[PDB]
C-alpha cells in the first residue's frame, strides 16, 4: 500500500525508530488484521467508528473472502464480526512501517500536521506498510533502525556541554534529567558541593552513558606533545577523553569521540550492550543536549568572520609576499633564468612553481585564521567539534578564497593569450590567471568573480555527472552479488550454488561485530618482546610483588609449572614468526571479532581490580585457560584433517592475538586480573566470538555492494583515481586511461640515483625523432665530393677504407644531425645508434658515424651498394626517412612513453625488511613509475625486482601472472582508490567482489544490466510438541 | 572539410610524400585532393596553385 | 649482444629447473640456486657464437614418487618452430619412452606447428612455453599465492567433507600462466594457500576447466 | 520464452533482415505513392498511417545515400542483424549508452571500437534545422 | 543426529519462527505456556521461545540438497 | 521492430470473381486481408511491398470456394520481449505514462517509473516531472523504454514497458 509522497521535516522529540505520519495519509492506508477473542472488542469498536472518523476500517473481509465496504454500513448485522475475520483497520500508533536494497523499519506515530516527521540522527518519501503479520514481525526484528546503525546541531553543543567550564545549577539539572529516559531516578551528588551545588556537564552526561563501558579517545584539538608530557593523565586542555564504569571522568566529546568511527562511545556501546541500548544513547544525547542548548545557545554572526587587525596585516603580508614571489618566478622565466626540472618541461615547471606559492599562501594564511579565532568564536566551535564545515571553509571566509583551478589547471587563455580582455596579452600573474586573493567577507574583485564562477561551474558539472555515474555503479554491483549469500555450511554461494568463498570474509565472522585492535606481539623487537612477554620466575622479589606469597612458592616448588610457562612463551615466539610473513608491511592495526583490551578493562572495573596488591591469579591458570578457550572457539566444526586444518587457518590471527594478550607475564605484570576475573574473561570471549559467527542466511553480497557503493559517492605522474578508475576496475576494458606500472629496483642500484638512470633509459622507449636535431638530403656527384664543407674533414678519413665502395655508389645522401642534449640524458653512443639502424633495417642501407667528441654529431646514411646495382633512391630515401623517425626503437620497450623516477616518501612503496634487532625498518629504495603496461617485458629486465614489481592494470596482470594474481591486484587497486580519500571499507566486502569476478577463472565485467531471499530453511510443524497446550478462549 | 592526412599511416609512396591535403566536396562521397579542385576551376598552371595558397614565396 | 644472451639464457635455465621442483620432480639442490658465475663456468664458453648452444641445454629429471616418470625440456634452437622439428622431438622422445616433455619456444611459433600440440596422442603431452614467459618465475611473485596440486585421493576426500561438485568449485582457465607453470590439465584441483589479511591463512581450491 | 536481450526469438525471424525507421519510411512512401495514384483502391489502413508518422518523426537520415552508408559501414563488422537496426534506430550517444541499452553488444564489442562506430552514425544523422 | 550446523539459532530463524508463530496465535492457535494477560500475539510467541515450547521445527536446507531438522528448543537462543 | 519477411496466406476467393484476369482480383484481395491487420504471431502487418508468387487455386469440396495459397513480401512490427525502443507519449494519467510505439500502444505503470518521478495533476498538460525538475515527460515526448513483456489480446498486441533500467527517459 504505497502512500502519497510528502516532504520530510525533522523532529528530535521522536525516537530515531519512530516516524511521524499525518492523519490523512494514515486514514487512506489500511492494515489487515486477524480478529481474535483477546481483541474482538478492539475491532468491534474501530469498525463501528466508520471511515468518516479517522480510527476506522476501510474494509472487512469474511472467512469466505468477501470484502464489505464500511463506508455504506447497510445493516448493523453485517457490521458485526466473527472470530477469524480480517479487518482492514486504518493505521494507528505503534504500527510498523518500512521505507528507504536495504530498507529500515519505523514505528508510526500520528501527528496533527501534514508533513512527515523523522528524527534525523527535505526530500519526499513514500512509506510502505507490511500487511502480513509474518513480515511485520520479521521487519521489527531485523530491519529496525537500531539494528541498521548524530546531527550536526547536537555534536557542536555536545562539545560545549562537556567543557569543564560548563556548570549546571540545581534548577537546570532538573530539566535535563527529566528528558533522560534511562534515569535511575536519583540525582547524582554535585561535583562542587559548596558554596552552592553545581553539576558539571560530564556528570549529567555520565547518566546518559548506558551501563559500564570503558574507552579512551582524544579531542580534535589535542596537542601531540601533551600525551608525551607529564600532564598526559591530567590534560591541561581537557583534550583527552576517558570513560570508566560508564562515567565520563574527563575529556570534551566531539565527532571523534561520540561520532561514528572505529572507536567511539556509540560504537563501543553497540558491541558491549547491543542495538536497543545504543538507540536510547542516541535519543538521550539528542534530547538532553537540545534542552541545554536553550540555555547555552548556539549562533553565528559577522563577529565570527571579523578577525583582529593583527591577523589581517599578516594575511595581506603573506598575500603580498606570495604575489611578489610569483612575479620573481615570472621574471626568471621571462629572462630564461629559470631551469626546468629533468622530469618536466619549462612551461609545466613554471605552472608548478607558481601553483605551490599560491597554494602555500592559502594554507599558511588559512592556518593563521584558525589560530586567530577565539574559544568564544562560533566559527571555531563548529570546526573544533568537527560537526559541520571545515578549516578550508573558514580560510576562504577570513583569510583568502584561493586559486580557482579549472580542469585541474589555472584559468585558461580563453581570449588571445589573455584570460580576460582587461589583462594584457600573455599575462601569467596571480590576478590574470584566477588567483583570488580576497576572502568572501572582504569581497571579490570583478575579475575574481568571473574566475570564481568558472571554478564553481566545473564543480557543479562534476557533481552532476558524479551522482549519475556513482549511482550506476551501485545498481550494477548489487545485481552481480544479489544472489550471493552465506549458506548453512558456513560457505558463500550464489543462486547457481557455486562456491564463491569457503568461509565468509575468509574467517567466517560478521563485519559489524568486528572491532579494530592492534596485537602487540609483532612490532616489538627481540629485546622488548622477550622482556614484555616471557615470564621471568628467577627474580624472587619481583614475583612476590606480582603474586601472593603462596603463588610464588607454588611456581618455584614444582618444575612442571615452570616448563609450561616457558612453553607458552615459545608458542608466542612461534606466533611472532608466522605473523611477519602474514604482515610484510608490519602494520599493527588489524580487524578482529572482539576487543580483548577493552574486555580486560571491563573485568578490572567489574571486580575492582587494583594493581597495588599482588594478583591472586595463578599464572598456570592463564596458559591452561587459554588452551581450553582456543578449543571451544570453533569455526569449521568436524574431526577430519581438512576441518582441523581449516579451523587453525580461520582462527590463526585470533588465537595469536588471544595468547599474546592473555599470557602469564602480562596477567601478573600489568593487567593484574584476579582468579575470578580471568574466569569471567574467558566466558565473555567465548560468548562474544560465538555471536560474531556469520549467521547463515545473510545477504553478504548485497551488504558488500551497499558497503562498496556508499564510499563511491565520496570519491570525486598523473594516476587516474575516483570514479574514472572505479569504472575501469569493474569494467575489464582492455585499454584504461593511464595504465601506469610501478617498477621496484633491487640491489645496489636501488639506493643510488645515477645507477637507477640507466634502468630508466633501458625501460623508456625512445625514437630517432627524440634524439635527432635536423635532417636533409644533399647531393654529391662522386664519393669524394662531400659537398657539405663542415663534414668534409671527418668523412674523408672514415671513407678511406673501401667499406661498401667496391662498386658505384649513388650520389644521394640522408645526412641527419643528432641533438647533443638528448644524447646525454639517454647516455647513448653513436655506435649504438648506427648498429640498430643497420641491424634493424638489414643490409638495405649503410650508415656512417662521426667522432663522439665532436660538438655536432653527424650521421650520414646511404642506400646499400648491393641494392644500387619506382622510387630508385630519391623518393625511397624520403620514404625510409619517415619510417626510421617513427617506428625505430634504439633502446627501450614499446608502449612506454615516459618513466617517472623519485624516492617514495610513503611507507607502502618503501621496502620493509626485518632488522637484526627485530624492529621493523623501512629503507629508501628508488622506484620507477612508468606510463603504459609492459609487465611481461619490464619484469624480465636486469636490476628489476621480479617480486615487488606490480602493475595497476588487471588485464595485463591476468595475461602475465594469472587470474589468481589479479584477485590481489584488483583488491589493491580497489583499496587504493577507496583509501585515497581517507575512507575505509572492510576487507571481507572487497574480497567478495574480487572472488565473484574471478570465480569463473577469467576476468568478468560486472553485470551491466543493473536492474536492481530467506529460503534456505523451512519451518515444520511437530505434533509431539503440540500435545501440550490450552486454547486461550 | 579541407582535411590534411596524418603522418601516422605508413606506405611505400605515402611515407615519401608524407602529409598531403585532401578536400571532400559536399556532393562527392570520396575525398578528392584540393589541388585538383583548383585545376577544375581553371588554373591549369601549377604555379597559379601555389600563388593562391602560398602568399609568401620567400618562406 | 653476447653478454645479454648469457643472462637471458641463464634465467631460463634457472626458472626451468625450479619449474620441475615446483611440479614435484627430483631436482638437484645446486641446480636450483646455481649462480650466473657458475653458468659460464659450467659450459666454459659464451652461448652465442660459441660451443654452448640450446641443444645441449636440455635437462633430464625424474619424478620424486617414481623414477620412471622422467621429464624433458627441449630447446628448438631456431627463430621459428615448425612441424618437422616438433615431429623429430617427439620421435626422439619415443626412444626414451617418456610421456611428458617441455618445449621452450622462441617469441615466434608457426601456427601450423601449434596444431601439433592439439592432434597429439593422449599419451603425448607437449606444453609450449614462450621464451619471454620463462625469463621470470611467476610463482615467486608476491601477488601470486602458493599453489599446490591436489592428488586424486585428496580431491575425492575434499568433496566428501564439503559435499561439493566439480562445477560448484571456482574455475580456473587451463591457459593461465600459473596453470601452465604447473602443467595441470582439466579435472585437476589446485590448492591455494593465500595469506588472507582477515584470517591470516585461507585455503582455496580451484578446478581447471 | 523469447527475450531480445539474450538474442532468443522465433526461428522464423532469423531469415528476415532488419530495417531502419527512416528506411521503412521510404518503403511506406513507395507503397503510399502507388496506392494514391497508380490504382483506384480504398484509402490506406489507419495502421499504415500511424507507422508512417512514427518513422517520419524518428527518421535519423535524410536520403538513401546516408542510409546506405550506415548500413554498409555496420555490415563490415560482425554486428548481428538484430543489433543492426536497433543500434541505428536508437542512435546511442556514447559506447556506454549502447551496451546498457543493448546487452548483446557487450559480449563481442570493446569499449573503444564501438565508440568509433556510434560517432560515425552521429556524423551521418542530420537534423531538420 | 549427525547434525553439523551451528547449535545457535540465527537471527533470521528467530524472526521467522516468532513471526509464523505469532500469525498462528492470532489464528486461534493453542498456547503451550501460561497466559498472564499478554494480548499482543508477538509477546505470546516471544515467551514461548523463552520457555522452549514452540512446536515449529526448523528444516535447514544445506546447499548440497541435504536437510537437517533442528528444533527451536534444541537450538540455543540468546536472551 | 521492423523486419522483411515472406509469409503465406490462404486467400478465399468467391466464384463471382472467376471472370477474365481473375489473378488480378486475387492480387488486389491480398492488399486487404493481410494489409492493415495484426497477426498475434508476427505482429502488425503495416504494409506489403510486393507479391512473390501465387500458388495453384484448389477448389474446396462442398464449400465451392477456391483457395489460393499466395506468397508475398511484407514488413511487420513485432515487439520482442525485453527490447528497448523509442516511444511517443499519447496521454498521462495517475496510473502511469501511456506511450505509443508505432502502430501499437504501450502502457507504463507507475511502479515501473523511477521513484524520483511524481505525477502532477495541476500542471497543464500533465507530465511526470521529478522534484528536481531536471527531466519532464510531456505528451508527444520522445522517450526510450524497455518492454518487459507483451500480451496478445483480441487479435492485437499490447506491450508493457519500464524505465527502471539505466538511461531510460527523455534521452
Residue ranges per structural domain of chain D: 1-129
Residue partners of C153: CB distance under 8 A and separation at least 6: none
Answer yes or no: do C33 and C111 share one domain: yes
Answer yes or no: do C13 and C103 share one domain: yes
Give C130's contacts in chain A (Cβ within 8 Å). Answer: none
Answer yes or no: do C77 and C116 share one domain: yes
**A–E contact: 3+ Cβ pairs < 8 A:** yes
Gap between the Cα atoms of A953 and A101, Å rounded: 31
Residue that is written with C-alpha cell 649482444 in the block: C1
Asked if the bond preceding F125 is cis, omega within 30° of 0, the reply is yes
Contact A640 C11 (CB under 8 A): no
Strands A816-818 and A857-863: antiparallel
Instruction: Tell me the three cell numbers of residue A652.
Output: 590463526
A31 touches A58 (CB < 8 A): no
Contact A1021 E27 (CB under 8 A): no
A718 touches A464 (CB < 8 A): no
Contact A883 B10 (CB under 8 A): yes
Instruction: Tell me the three cell numbers of residue A873.
Output: 633512391
Instruction: Tell me the three cell numbers of residue A400.
Output: 583568502
**A–D contact: 3+ Cβ pairs < 8 A:** yes
F51 CB near a chain D CB, below 8 Å? no
Contact A500 C170 (CB under 8 A): yes
Q: How far is CA A262 from CA A224, A247, A515, A595, in A?
A: 20, 21, 7, 12
Residue partners of D11: CB distance under 8 A and separation at least 6: none
Q: How far is CA A119 from CA A7, A25, A145, A175, D115, in A?
A: 14, 19, 11, 21, 48
Residue partners of A223: CB distance under 8 A and separation at least 6: A237, A239
Task: State the SS3 of D47-59.
Answer: HHHHHHHHHHHCC
Instruction: Tell me the three cell numbers of residue D47.
Output: 495502421
D97 CB near a chain A CB, below 8 Å? no
Task: Calculate the dihedral angle through the C-alpha atoms of A922, A923, A924, A927, rounding to the nearest 10 degrees.
Answer: -70
CA dihedral (A151, A156, A157, A161) positive or negative:
positive
F138 touches F132 (CB < 8 A): no
Answer yes or no: do C110 and C196 share one domain: no
**Phi/psi of residue A398, nearest 5 degrees:** -105, -60
Answer yes or no: do C66 and C131 share one domain: yes
Angle at A136 between CA E28 and CA F163, to 5 degrees: 135
Give E25's contacts in chain A (Cβ within 8 Å). Answer: 36
Gap between the Cα atoms of A65 and A51, Å rounded: 21
Q: Nearest C-alpha of chain C: how many angstroms from A825?
A: 23
Per-position DSSP letters for A129-147, written without gaps between them: ---SHHHHHHHHHHSBHHH
Q: What DSSP designation does A198 have?
A: B
Nearest residue on chain E to A699, alpha-carbon basis: E12
DSSP-based three-state secondary structure for A177? helix
Q: Nearest C-alpha of chain A: how many angstroms from B8?
A: 8
Select from E6, E31, E64 the Cβ nearest to the Cβ of A1029. Answer: E31
Q: Nearest C-alpha of chain D: how many angstroms from F23?
A: 16
Give A34's contacts in chain E (Cβ within 8 Å). Answer: 23, 26-27
Give D112's contacts in chain A (Cβ within 8 Å). Answer: 733-735
F91 touches F108 (CB < 8 A): no
In angstroms, this model's resolution equals 3.5
Contact F166 A472 (CB under 8 A): yes
Q: Nearest C-alpha of chain F: how many angstroms from D102?
A: 8
Find the length of chain F: 171
Contact E28 A1026 (CB under 8 A): no
Number of Cβ atoms within 10 Å of the Cβ of A88: 20
Contact E11 A1026 (CB under 8 A): no
Nearest residue on chain E to A136, alpha-carbon basis: E19
Where do the domains of chain F lie? 1-80, 81-171
Nearest to F144 by CA among F128, F116, F120, F166: F166
Gap between the Cα atoms of F113 and F115, Å rounded: 6
Report the DSSP beta bridge partners of residue C102: C73, C127
Which C residues in the span 32-91 are in contact with A, Cβ-Cβ below 8 Å? Answer: none
Contact B16 A876 (CB under 8 A): yes
Of C78, C108, C136, the position where a domain reaches its end is C136
Residue that is written with C-alpha cell 581449516 in the block: A646
Give E59's contacts in chain A (Cβ within 8 Å). Answer: 1017-1020
Q: Which CATH class is domain A152-296?
A: mainly alpha
Decide: residue F70, CB within 10 A, 0-12 exposed, 13-18 middle, 19+ buried. buried
Gap between the Cα atoms of A176 and A210, Å rounded: 16
A135 CB near a chain E CB, below 8 Å? yes
**Phi/psi of residue A241, nearest 5 degrees:** -105, 125
Answer yes or no: do C152 and C59 share one domain: no
Gap between the Cα atoms of A818 and A820, Å rounded: 6
A126 CB near a chain F CB, below 8 Å? yes
Answer yes or no: do C157 and C131 share one domain: no
Of C86, C106, C136, the position where a domain reaches its end is C136
**Helix (H) or strand (E) run with residue A467 in it:** helix A446-481
Nearest to C100 by CA among C3, C154, C23, C189: C23
What number of C-beta contacts closer than 8 Å exist between C and E? 5
Gap between the Cα atoms of F86 and D101, Å rounded: 11
Residue partners of A293: CB distance under 8 A and separation at least 6: A153, A157
Nearest to F144 by CA among D101, A721, A135: D101
Give the mutation candidate from A769, A873, A879 for the B interface (greatest B CB count, under 10 A). Answer: A879
Select from F115, F131, F165 the Cβ nearest to the Cβ of A1011. Answer: F165
**E–F contact: 3+ Cβ pairs < 8 A:** no
What number of C-beta contacts closer than 8 Å exist between A and D? 18
Q: Nearest C-alpha of chain A: how many angstroms from F165?
A: 6
A131 touches A32 (CB < 8 A): yes
Nearest to A473 by CA among A728, A100, A720, A699: A728
E79 touches E9 (CB < 8 A): no
Residue that is written with C-alpha cell 552521429 in the block: D122
Nearest residue on chain D to A735, alpha-carbon basis: D112
Strands F156-162 and A816-818: unpaired
Gap between the Cα atoms of A292 and A199, Å rounded: 13
Nearest residue on chain A to C136, alpha-carbon basis: A940
Q: Structural domain of residue C142, as residue ranges?
A: 137-209
Answer yes or no: do C76 and C154 share one domain: no
D106 CB near a chain A CB, below 8 Å? yes
**Phi/psi of residue A627, nearest 5 degrees:** -60, -45
Select from E14, E26, E55 the Cβ nearest to the Cβ of A36. Answer: E26
Q: How far is CA F28 from CA A394, F20, F58, F70, in A?
A: 84, 14, 19, 12
E4 CB near a chain C CB, below 8 Å? no
Gap between the Cα atoms of A198 and F71, Å rounded: 102
Instruction: Tell me the three cell numbers of residue C103.
Output: 618445449
Select from F49, F83, F86 the Cβ nearest to the Cβ of D4. Answer: F83
Gap between the Cα atoms of F35 and D39, Å rounded: 16
Q: How far is CA D4 from CA A1007, D108, F46, F147, in A?
A: 17, 16, 21, 10
Gap between the Cα atoms of F124 and C171, Å rounded: 59
Q: How many CA atoms lie within 13 A of D123 on its CB side?
A: 10
**Phi/psi of residue B22, nearest 5 degrees:** -125, 135
Select from C11, C142, C158 the Cβ nearest to the Cβ of A642. Answer: C158
Nearest to A391 by CA among A411, A371, A412, A413: A371
Residue partners of C140: CB distance under 8 A and separation at least 6: A946, A947
Amino acid at each position: 500500500d504505497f502512500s502519497a509522497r510528502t516532504v520530510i521535516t525533522p523532529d528530535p522529540n521522536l525516537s530515531i525508530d519512530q516516524v511521524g505520519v499525518p492523519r490523512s495519509i494514515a486514514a487512506n492506508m489500511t492494515f489487515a488484521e486477524i480478529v481474535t477473542p483477546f481483541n474482538i472488542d478492539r475491532l468491534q469498536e474501530l469498525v463501528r467508528r466508520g471511515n468518516s472518523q479517522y480510527p476506522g476500517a476501510k474494509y472487512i473481509i469474511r472467512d469466505n473472502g468477501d470484502r464489505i465496504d464500511l463506508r455504506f454500513h447497510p445493516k448493523p448485522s453485517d457490521l458485526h464480526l466473527q472470530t477469524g475475520y480480517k479487518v482492514e483497520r486504518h493505521m494507528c500508533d505503534g504500527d510498523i512501517v518500512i521505507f528507504n536494497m536495504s530498507m529500515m523499519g519505523h514505528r508510526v506515530r500520528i501527528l496533527p500536521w501534514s508533513t512527515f516527521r523523522l528524527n534525523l540522527s527535505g526530500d519526499e518519501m513514500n512509506l510502505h506498510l507490511p500487511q502480513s503479520l509474518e513480515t511485520r514481525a520479521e521487519i521489527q526484528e531485523l530491519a529496525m533502525v537500531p539494528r541498521m546503525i548524530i546531527v550536526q546541531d547536537t555534536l557542536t553543543a555536545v562539545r560545549k556541554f562537556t567543557k569543564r567550564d560548563v556548570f549546571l545549577e540545581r534548577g537546570e539539572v532538573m530539566n535535563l534529567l527529566m528528558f533522560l529516559s534511562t534515569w535511575d531516578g536519583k540525582v547524582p551528588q554535585p561535583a562542587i558541593l559548596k558554596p552552592r551545588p553545581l553539576w558539571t556537564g560530564k556528570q549529567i552526561f555520565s547518566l546518559i552513558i548506558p551501563g559500564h563501558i570503558n574507552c579512551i579517545r582524544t579531542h580534535s584539538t589535542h596537542p601531540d606533545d601533551e600525551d608525551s608530557g607529564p600532564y598526559k593523565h591530567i590534560s591541561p586542555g581537557d583534550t583527552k577523553v576517558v570513560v570508566e564504569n560508564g562515567e565520563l571522568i574527563m575529556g570534551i566529546l566531539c565527532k571523534k569521540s561520540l561520532g561514528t568511527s572505529a572507536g567511539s562511545l556509540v560504537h563501543i556501546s553497540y558491541l558491549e550492550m547491543g542495538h536497543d541500548i545504543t538507540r536510547l544513547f542516541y535519543s538521550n544525547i539528542q534530547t538532553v543536549i537540545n534542552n541545554w542548548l536553550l540555555i547555552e545557545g548556539h549562533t553565528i554572526g559577522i563577529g565570527d568572520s571579523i578577525a583582529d587587525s593583527k591577523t589581517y596585516q599578516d594575511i595581506q603580508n603573506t598575500i603580498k609576499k606570495a604575489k611578489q614571489d610569483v612575479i620573481e618566478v615570472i621574471e626568471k622565466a621571462h629572462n630564461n633564468e629559470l631551469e626546468p626540472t629533468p622530469g618536466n618541461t619549462l612551461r609545466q615547471t613554471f605552472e608548478n612553481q607558481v601553483n605551490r606559492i599560491l597554494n602555500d599562501a592559502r594554507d599558511k594564511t588559512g592556518s593563521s585564521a584558525q589560530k586567530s579565532l577565539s574559544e568564544y568564536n562560533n566559527f571555531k566551535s563548529m570546526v573544533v567539534s568537527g560537526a559541520k564545515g571545515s578549516k578550508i571553509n573558514i580560510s576562504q571566509v577570513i583569510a583568502v578564497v584561493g586559486q580557482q583551478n579549472v580542469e585541474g589547471k589555472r584559468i585558461p587563455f580563453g581570449f588571445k593569450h589573455r584570460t580576460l580582455p582587461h589583462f594584457i596579452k600573455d599575462d601569467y600573474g596571480p590576478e590574470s590567471r584566477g588567483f583570488v586573493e580576497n576572502s568572501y567577507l572582504a569581497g571579490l574583485t570583478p575579475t575574481e568573480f568571473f574566475f570564481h564562477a568558472m571554478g564553481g561551474r566545473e564543480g557543479l558539472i562534476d557533481t552532476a555527472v558524479k551522482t549519475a555515474e556513482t549511482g550506476y555503479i551501485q545498481r550494477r554491483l548489487i545485481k552481480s552479488m544479489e544472489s550471493v549469500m552465506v549458506k548453512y555450511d558456513a560457505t558463500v554461494r550464489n543462486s547457481i550454488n557455486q562456491v564463491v568463498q569457503l568461509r565468509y570474509g575468509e574467517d567466517g565472522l560478521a563485519g559489524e561485530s568486528v572491532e579494530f585492535q592492534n596485537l602487540a606481539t609483532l612490532k616489538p623487537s627481540n629485546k622488548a618482546f622477550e622482556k614484555k612477554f616471557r615470564f621471568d620466575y628467577t627474580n624472587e622479589r619481583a614475583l612476590r610483588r606480582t603474586l601472593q606469597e603462596d603463588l610464588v612458592k607454588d611456581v618455584l616448588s614444582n618444575a612442571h609449572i615452570q616448563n609450561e610457562l616457558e612453553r607458552e612463551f615459545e608458542r608466542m615466539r612461534e606466533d611472532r614468526e608466522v605473523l611477519r610473513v602474514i604482515f610484510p608491511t608490519g602494520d599493527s592495526k588489524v580487524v578482529l571479532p572482539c576487543n580483548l583490551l577493552r574486555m580486560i578493562w571491563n573485568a578490572q572495573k567489574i571486580f575492582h581490580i587494583n594493581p597495588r596488591l599482588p594478583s591472586d591469579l595463578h599464572p598456570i591458570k592463564v596458559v591452561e585457560g587459554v588452551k581450553e578457550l582456543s578449543k571451544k572457539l570453533v569455526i569449521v566444526n568436524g574431526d577430519d584433517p581438512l576441518s582441523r586444518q581449516a579451523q587453525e587457518n580461520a582462527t590463526l590471527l585470533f588465537n595469536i592475538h588471544l595468547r599474546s594478550t592473555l599470557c602469564s607475564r602480562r596477567m601478573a605484570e600489568e593487567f593484574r586480573l584476579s582468579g575470578e576475573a580471568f574466569d569471567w574473561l574467558l566466558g565473555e570471549i567465548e560468548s562474544k566470538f560465538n555471536q560474531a559467527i556469520a549467521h547463515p542466511g545473510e545477504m553478504v553480497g548485497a551488504l558488500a555492494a551497499q558497503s562498496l557503493g556508499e564510499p563511491a559517492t565520496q570519491m570525486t605522474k598523473n594516476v587516474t583515481l575516483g570514479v574514472p578508475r572505479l569504472k575501469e576496475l569493474i569494467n575489464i576494458s582492455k585499454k584504461p586511461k593511464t595504465p601506469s606500472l610501478t617498477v621496484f629496483l633491487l640491489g645496489q642500484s636501488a639506493r643510488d640515483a645515477e645507477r637507477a638512470k640507466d634502468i630508466l633509459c633501458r625501460l623508456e622507449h625512445t625514437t630517432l625523432r627524440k634524439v635527432t636535431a635536423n635532417t636533409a638530403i644533399y647531393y654529391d656527384p662522386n664519393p669524394q665530393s662531400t659537398v657539405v664543407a663542415e663534414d668534409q674533414e671527418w668523412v674523408n678519413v672514415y671513407y678511406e677504407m673501401p667499406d661498401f665502395d667496391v662498386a658505384r655508389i649513388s650520389p644521394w645522401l640522408l645526412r641527419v644531425e643528432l641533438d647533443r642534449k638528448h644524447m646525454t640524458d639517454r647516455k647513448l653512443t653513436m655506435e649504438q645508434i648506427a648498429e640498430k639502424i643497420n641491424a634493424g633495417f638489414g643490409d638495405d642501407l649503410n650508415c656512417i658515424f662521426n667522432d663522439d667528441n665532436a660538438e655536432k654529431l653527424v650521421l650520414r646514411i646511404r642506400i646499400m651498394n648491393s641494392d644500387e646495382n619506382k622510387m630508385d633512391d630519391d623518393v625511397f630515401l624520403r620514404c625510409i626517412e619517415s619510417n626510421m623517425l617513427t617506428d625505430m626503437t634504439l633502446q627501450g620497450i614499446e608502449q612506454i612513453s615516459k618513466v617517472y623516477m623519485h624516492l617514495p616518501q610513503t611507507d607502502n612503496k618503501k621496502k620493509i625488511i626485518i632488522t637484526e634487532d627485530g624492529e621493523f625498518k623501512a629503507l629508501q629504495e628508488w622506484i620507477l613509475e612508468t606510463d603504459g603496461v609492459s609487465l611481461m617485458r619490464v619484469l624480465s629486465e636486469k636490476d628489476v625486482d621480479p617480486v615487488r614489481t606490480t602493475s595497476n592494470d588487471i588485464v595485463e596482470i591476468f595475461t602475465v601472472l594469472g587470474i589468481e594474481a589479479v584477485r590481489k591486484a584488483l583488491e589493491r587497486e580497489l583499496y587504493h582508490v577507496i583509501s585515497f580519500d581517507g575512507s575505509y571499507v572492510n576487507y571481507r566486502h572487497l574480497a567478495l567482489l574480487c572472488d565473484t569476478m574471478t570465480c569463473r577463472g577469467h576476468l568478468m565485467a560486472i553485470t551491466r544490466h543493473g536492474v536492481n531471499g530467506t529460503g534456505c530453511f523451512d519451518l515444520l510443524l511437530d505434533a509431539e510438541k503440540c500435545k501440550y497446550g490450552m486454547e486461550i478462549p | 572539410w579541407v582535411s590534411m592526412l596524418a603522418r601516422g599511416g605508413q606506405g611505400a609512396k605515402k611515407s615519401a610524400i608524407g602529409q598531403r591535403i585532401v578536400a571532400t566536396l559536399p556532393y562527392i562521397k570520396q575525398e578528392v585532393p584540393i589541388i585538383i579542385v583548383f585545376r577544375a576551376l581553371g588554373f591549369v598552371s601549377d604555379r597559379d596553385i601555389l600563388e593562391h595558397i602560398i602568399y609568401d614565396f620567400e618562406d | 649482444d653476447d653478454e645479454e644472451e648469457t643472462y637471458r639464457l641463464w634465467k631460463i635455465r634457472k626458472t626451468i629447473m625450479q619449474l620441475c621442483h615446483d611440479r614435484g620432480y627430483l631436482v638437484t639442490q645446486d641446480e636450483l640456486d646455481q649462480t650466473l658465475e657458475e653458468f659460464k663456468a659450467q659450459f666454459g664458453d659464451k652461448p652465442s657464437e660459441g660451443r654452448p648452444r640450446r641443444t645441449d641445454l636440455t635437462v633430464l629429471v625424474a619424478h620424486n614418487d617414481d623414477p620412471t616418470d622422467q621429464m624433458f625440456v627441449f630447446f628448438p634452437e631456431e627463430p621459428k618452430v615448425g612441424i618437422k622439428t616438433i615431429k623429430v622431438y617427439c620421435q626422439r622422445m619415443q626412444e626414451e619412452n617418456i610421456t611428458r616433455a617441455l618445449i621452450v619456444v622462441q617469441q615466434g611459433m608457426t601456427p601450423s606447428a601449434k596444431q601439433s600440440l592439439v592432434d597429439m596422442a593422449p599419451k603425448y603431452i607437449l606444453e609450449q612455453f614462450l621464451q619471454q614467459e620463462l625469463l621470470i618465475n611467476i610463482t615467486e611473485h608476491e601477488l601470486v599465492p602458493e599453489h599446490v596440486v591436489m592428488t586424486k585421493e585428496e580431491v575425492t576426500e575434499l568433496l566428501a567433507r564439503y559435499k561439493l561438485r566439480e562445477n560448484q568449485l571456482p574455475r580456473i582457465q587451463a591457459g593461465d600462466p600459473v596453470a601452465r607453470y604447473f602443467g595441470i590439465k582439466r579435472g585437476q584441483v589446485v590448492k591455494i594457500i593465500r595469506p588472507s589479511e582477515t584470517a591470516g591463512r585461507y585455503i582455496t581450491y580451484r578446478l581447471v576447466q | 520464452e523469447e527475450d531480445a536481450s539474450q538474442l532468443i526469438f522465433p526461428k522464423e525471424f532469423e531469415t528476415a533482415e532488419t530495417l531502419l525507421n527512416s528506411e521503412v519510411h521510404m518503403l511506406l512512401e513507395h507503397r503510399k505513392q502507388q496506392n494514391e495514384s497508380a490504382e483506384d483502391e480504398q484509402e490506406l489502413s489507419e495502421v499504415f498511417m500511424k507507422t508512417l508518422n512514427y518513422t517520419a518523426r524518428f527518421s535519423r537520415f535524410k536520403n538513401r545515400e546516408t542510409i546506405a552508408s550506415v548500413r554498409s559501414l555496420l555490415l563490415q563488422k560482425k554486428l548481428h542483424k538484430f543489433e543492426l537496426a536497433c543500434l541505428a534506430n536508437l542512435c546511442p550517444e556514447t559506447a556506454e549508452e549502447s551496451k546498457a541499452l543493448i546487452p548483446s553488444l557487450e559480449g563481442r564489442f570493446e569499449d573503444e571500437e564501438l565508440q568509433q562506430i556510434l560517432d560515425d552514425i552521429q556524423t551521418k544523422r542530420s537534423f531538420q534545422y | 543426529q549427525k547434525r553439523i550446523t551451528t547449535p545457535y539459532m540465527t537471527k533470521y530463524e528467530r524472526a521467522r519462527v516468532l513471526g509464523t508463530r505469532a500469525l498462528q496465535i492470532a489464528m486461534c492457535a493453542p498456547v503451550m505456556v501460561e497466559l498472564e494477560g499478554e494480548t499482543d500475539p508477538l509477546l505470546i510467541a516471544m515467551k514461548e521461545l523463552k520457555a522452549r515450547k514452540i512446536p515449529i521445527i526448523i528444516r535447514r536446507y544445506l546447499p548440497d540438497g541435504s536437510y537437517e531438522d533442528w528444533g527451536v528448543d534444541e537450538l540455543i537462543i540468546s536472551d | 521492430m521492423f523486419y522483411h519477411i515472406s509469409l503465406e496466406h490462404e486467400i478465399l476467393l468467391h466464384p463471382r470473381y472467376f471472370g477474365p484476369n481473375l489473378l488480378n482480383t486475387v492480387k488486389q484481395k491480398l492488399f486487404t486481408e493481410v494489409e492493415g491487420t495484426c497477426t498475434g504471431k508476427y505482429g502488425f502487418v503495416i504494409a506489403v511491398t510486393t507479391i512473390d508468387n501465387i500458388g495453384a487455386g484448389v477448389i474446396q469440396p462442398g464449400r465451392g470456394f477456391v483457395l489460393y495459397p499466395v506468397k508475398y513480401k511484407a514488413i511487420v512490427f513485432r515487439p520482442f520481449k525485453g527490447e528497448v525502443v523509442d516511444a511517443v507519449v499519447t496521454q498521462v494519467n495517475k496510473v502511469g505514462l501511456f506511450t505509443e510505439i508505432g502502430p501499437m500502444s504501450c502502457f507504463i505503470s507507475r511502479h515501473s517509473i523511477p521513484s524520483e518521478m511524481e505525477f502532477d495533476p495541476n500542471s497543464n498538460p500533465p507530465c511526470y516531472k521529478t522534484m528536481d525538475e531536471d527531466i519532464v515527460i510531456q505528451q508527444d515526448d520522445e522517450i526510450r523504454l524497455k518492454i518487459v513483456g507483451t500480451r496478445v489480446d483480441k487479435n492485437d498486441i499490447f506491450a508493457i514497458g519500464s524505465l527502471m533500467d539505466d538511461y531510460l527517459g527523455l534521452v
